[PDB]
Amino acid sequence: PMVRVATNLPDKDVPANFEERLTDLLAESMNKPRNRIAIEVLAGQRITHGASRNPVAVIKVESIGALSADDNIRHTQKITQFCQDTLKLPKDKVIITYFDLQPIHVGFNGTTVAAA
Amino acid sequence: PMVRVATNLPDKDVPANFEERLTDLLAESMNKPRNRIAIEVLAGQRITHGASRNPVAVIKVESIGALSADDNIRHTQKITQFCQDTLKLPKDKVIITYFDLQPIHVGFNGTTVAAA
Amino acid sequence: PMVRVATNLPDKDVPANFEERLTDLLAESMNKPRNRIAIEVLAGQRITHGASRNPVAVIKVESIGALSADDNIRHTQKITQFCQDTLKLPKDKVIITYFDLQPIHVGFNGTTVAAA
Numbered sequence A, B, C: 001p002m003v004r005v006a007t008n009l010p011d012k013d014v015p016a017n018f019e020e021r022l023t024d025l026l027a028e029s030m031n032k033p034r035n036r037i038a039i040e041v042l043a044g045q046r047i048t049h050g051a052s053r054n055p056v057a058v059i060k061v062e063s064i065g066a067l068s069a070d071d072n073i074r075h076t077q078k079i080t081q082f083c084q085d086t087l088k089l090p091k092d093k094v095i096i097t098y099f100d101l102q103p104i105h106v107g108f109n110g111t112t113v114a115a116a
């Protein structure tokens, strides 16, 4: 999985252990090994929702499977609660997109996942 | 919709009302409600096009529908004109990708849009 | 092609000619013209892989075709070797996602690529 979290909160409001705790959460929810999870954090960014600059997170989640309709309800419940607890965002200020990827469309260790 | 605008123009060159006006432009071109529109702006970024550092915008537009082939000509015309008027970019320096999403692949308010 | 390279390496460690060389590498690997290749470099960024902050690149490659299973094998070998040589990244610290786009989902010069 490859996760991007962008927020207009300042970098100092995203605790240093954010990536590591989000990696655990997704490892568990998506049944994926921790060494196959990358997290990007972009804090202090210009972001608006409804043209408002109130605190918000816009999140992208890519994974080779583990993203069925019912999985995504669970990932969303968990990620949203996690952003409430660690970022103090309201439940309605956490916007997530999922991308369900084929193994021919990911490259790792010098070749694609399908050709590993 | 969830829109990302990256530019090598400086942040001072992307006016403060940019996100507001883009939000209005998309609400109207897409017939989507203002409160379901997120805009990220990343200015002052390293970007090349044909390896040139001339001013350019690379834009991503995600939405659940409202992105048919025909819709996208309209969105492209309006977004490009808009970048011309507010960022002074040439018509041929505005690069846009559209991502037409299923509602099981979007998380908002703690669950998927499909489960709302 | 529209390529995003994010890394936790500092900006001063990603050479000024990075985007030139990557533009040539992709024009050649994908048989795409240089003037239809955009590259965004985001360095200095928070990124973890396996929760580790060791040097890493997370790369997104969008293109209208030129992304078959076979093509992606070659793109991956090339970009990975290129990251090793210019960024001193280990072979297993280059994570790439490919997005194979329809021409109705790409806006350029004020209309879709499909309608050009």
Ligand SMILES: O=C(O)c1ccccc1NCc1ccco1
Pocket (backbone or CB within 6 Å): A001, A002, A032, A035, A036, A037, A038, A062, A063, A064, A065, A106, A108, A113, C049, C095
């Ligand atoms: O994202 C997946 O689901 C995946 C599953 C198995 C192998 C690779 C994978 N790709 C992403 C990745 C590679 C290294 C770190 O993140």
Ligand SMILES: O=C(O)c1ccccc1NCc1ccco1
Pocket (backbone or CB within 6 Å): A049, A095, A096, B001, B002, B032, B035, B036, B037, B038, B062, B063, B064, B065, B106, B107, B108, B113
């Ligand atoms: O992207 C859409 O078309 C959409 C439609 C209905 C609900 C949510 C939606 N996107 C996620 C969102 C929530 C807030 C801002 O963006």
Ligand SMILES: O=C(O)c1ccccc1NCc1ccco1
Pocket (backbone or CB within 6 Å): B049, B095, C001, C002, C032, C035, C036, C037, C038, C062, C063, C064, C065, C106, C107, C108, C113
């Ligand atoms: O990405 C492609 O495969 C492509 C092919 C033909 C025309 C445009 C294209 N992409 C959008 C673009 C990138 C740089 C300028 O425009």
Ligand SMILES: [Zn+2]
Pocket (backbone or CB within 6 Å): A066, A067, A068, A071
């Ligand atoms: Zn599942």
Ligand SMILES: [Zn+2]
Pocket (backbone or CB within 6 Å): A115, A116
């Ligand atoms: Zn094998």
Ligand SMILES: [Zn+2]
Pocket (backbone or CB within 6 Å): A046, B011
């Ligand atoms: Zn600013």
Ligand SMILES: [Zn+2]
Pocket (backbone or CB within 6 Å): B020, B021, B024
């Ligand atoms: Zn307005």
Ligand SMILES: [Zn+2]
Pocket (backbone or CB within 6 Å): B070
């Ligand atoms: Zn038509």
Ligand SMILES: [Zn+2]
Pocket (backbone or CB within 6 Å): B046, C011, C012
């Ligand atoms: Zn620089």
Ligand SMILES: [Zn+2]
Pocket (backbone or CB within 6 Å): C020, C021, C024
């Ligand atoms: Zn060259």
